[PDB]
Amino acid sequence: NATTFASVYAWNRKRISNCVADYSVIYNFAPFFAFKCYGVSPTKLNDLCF
Amino acid sequence: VYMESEFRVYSSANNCTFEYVSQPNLREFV
Ligand SMILES: *[C@@H]1O[C@H](CO)[C@@H](O)[C@H](O)[C@H]1NC(C)=O
Secondary structure (H helix, E strand, C coil), X not given: CCCCCCCCCCXXXXXXXXXXXXXXXXXXXXXXXXXXXXXXXXXXXXXCCC | XXXXXXXXXXXXXXXXXXXXXXXXXXXXXX
16 A cells, blocks of 8 residues: 555565464455465465464 | 663664564562
């Protein structure tokens, strides 16, 4: 939901920890052009822990 | 301190993988 994203050469990174990783809120945004996952499965991503 | 305007305990910054905040004659600790 950020209003401005950084450029690709100066990409900004945020750390997510000590919270409830509810990935279901991501789907409320616009339809994603690409949602390729590697290793992890988006269907049961909430079931695993990281 | 000469309030508490200096934190020269550390010299630089790094990963900073974790952060936690809470409330602070004999006080034992383990
Ligand atoms: C968050 O997304 C909504 C649309 O899903 C948008 O209307 C809103 O402006 C966004 N928030 C910010 C702070 O831009």
